[PDB]
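Preliminary data (for renewal application), calcium ion complex.
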Amino acid sequence: YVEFDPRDPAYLSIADKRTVVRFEAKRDTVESAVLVTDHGNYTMKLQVWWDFGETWRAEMPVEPADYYILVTSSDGGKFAVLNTSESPFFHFDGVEGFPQLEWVSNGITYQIFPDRFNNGNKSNDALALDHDELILNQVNPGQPILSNWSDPITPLHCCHQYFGGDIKGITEKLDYLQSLGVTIIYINPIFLSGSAHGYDTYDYYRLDPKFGTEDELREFLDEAHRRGMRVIFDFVPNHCGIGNPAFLDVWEKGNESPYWDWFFVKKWPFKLGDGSAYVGWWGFGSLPKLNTANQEVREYLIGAALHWIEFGFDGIRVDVPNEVLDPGTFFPELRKAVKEKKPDAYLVGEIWTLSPEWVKGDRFDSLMNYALGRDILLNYAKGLLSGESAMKMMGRYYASYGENVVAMGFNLVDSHDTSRVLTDLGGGKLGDTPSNESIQRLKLLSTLLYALPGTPVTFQGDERGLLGDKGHYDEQRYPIQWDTVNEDVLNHYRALAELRKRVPALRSSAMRFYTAKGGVMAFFRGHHDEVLVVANSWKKPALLELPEGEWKVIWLRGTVEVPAIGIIILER
Ligand SMILES: [Ca+2]
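Predicted structure:
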C-alpha cells in the first residue's frame, strides 16, 4: 500500500523555492525511500505520522523533471512507485500553479476587533444608533447601548453595545504593533452595518461612520504600508443585514423589486426580522441569506471585493465560505478576479475544520487554521492531550495540506468568536486574576505558534494577558484597557517576534517530527533539521534523549530534562 498523487498539492507542491515530493504509506512499513529523478537522486525521510499512516518527503529545486520513488519496505522489500505502463516515469511541469506568498510566511499577524480595540475619535460614537439593527427590526425591536470604555458588560455585549473603537484608534497604535513585530493585520468588518461585529452588511461599498470616514481609512492603510505592514479585510458575501437597501427594496415591493432574485423570500408581505418569512443565516431574520448562486449577486459582491482591493487592502478574509452557494463557480471567479488586480493578495477562508478541498489552488490560499491552533494545539497546551496524541493529530494536518499551503497558513488559536486562550488554559474569568500556571501554558502555546510554518495570529490583547469567557455574554470582546499591562506577557510576545525573525528556520516550510514521550512533543524545523522544538505539557519535568549532535539553546548534549509546562528551542 502506497498513496501518491502529483496533481494534489499534498504530495507535490512548491515551497521555499523547492519541489516537495511526498507519499503516503502504512505506519511502520518503510525502512527507506529515495526520490529518483532525471539525473538526480534524493533520499526521503518521514516527516509526519498519525494513527494508521506515514508521510515521507524529499526536496529538489524547481526544474522540469521526470521522476519515480524507490521505496524499501520494512520486511526487506523493494518496490517502485510508477504510474501507468506506457509511461512509467512521472513528469513535473516545473511550472508554478499554487505560489507560496513570502510575505505571509515571514510575517506576524494581529487580529483587530475594531469597536473594542482603541477609540481614537470620540465624535463618531453616536453615529452607531441610527442604522442599528434593533431600531429597524419590526419583529424583536430593541434599543442599542452606548457606553464608556470601562463600563460593565451587558447582555448586548456581543452586538448592539458600542464602546467607540474606530479606524483612527488602530492608526494611533501602529507604533505599538510593530513593537510586537506585527507585519500583517486582520481587521474585522468595517462596512456599513447595524451591529458591533459588523456581519450584517448594509452597503459593501460604503464605510460605516461608526469606525470612520474613507479618509481616516486611507490614512490607516497608507501609514501601515510605509511601516511595511499589510491589512486583510473581512468579506461577508453569504448574507447581509435588514438595512441593506436592496433588501429594503424587496421589503415594500415584493415581485416589483428587481432585487427579488437576490433573496429567498418565503412570505410576502413581511415584517423585517421575521426568520420564517425569508431564508437567513441559521434561520435568523437579522441576517437574510444572499442568493450567491445568482449571477447579479455574484458580480456585485466580487465587484465590492475588487473595489476594496483597489482601495489599498492587500488581502481578503471570507466569512462562512461553506454556506456560499455554488462554491465551484464563486470562489474560483473570486480568486481569479482578485489575483489579477493584485497577484500578491492573501485569500483566507473561515473553515473551522481540516478540509483540504478549500486549499487546492483554485479557491483559497489558506484557511483560518482552527484545526491546528485551537483544535490540537490549545488542547495540548492545556496539559490534557499527550505528546503521542498531539503529534498524531498534527501528522494528519501536515500530511493533508500542501507544504506551500502550510507555509502561508493563517495560524490562529482564538478570535472574536471564541474565549481567550488564557481563559481556555484555566486562567479564570474576566475580572479575575490570571493564575501564574495558566501563563506558563500561554507562553507554551505562543511559542508553539511562532515556531511552526505559516504566520502566527494573535487576537487583540492576548499579548496583554487578558481573560474572557465566550459563554458570559462574549467577554472576549471587552475593550482593551490601555492603562493596564502585563509587562511580562507583553515582552514575552516581543521576544518571540524577534526570535522568529532572527531564526530563518522558524519561518521556513520544512518541519520534521522527532518523538513524543507522554507530555513531550518534539519536532524539527528547517530544511537541514537545524532547529529542534521540544515541549512538555505536564506538571512534572520529563526526561528526553536528544537527536545526534550538539545543540545551542535559544529559548546541549546527550539526554536532557525538559521542564514542566516548558518549551525549549535548540539549534545546531
Ligand atoms: Ca469612536
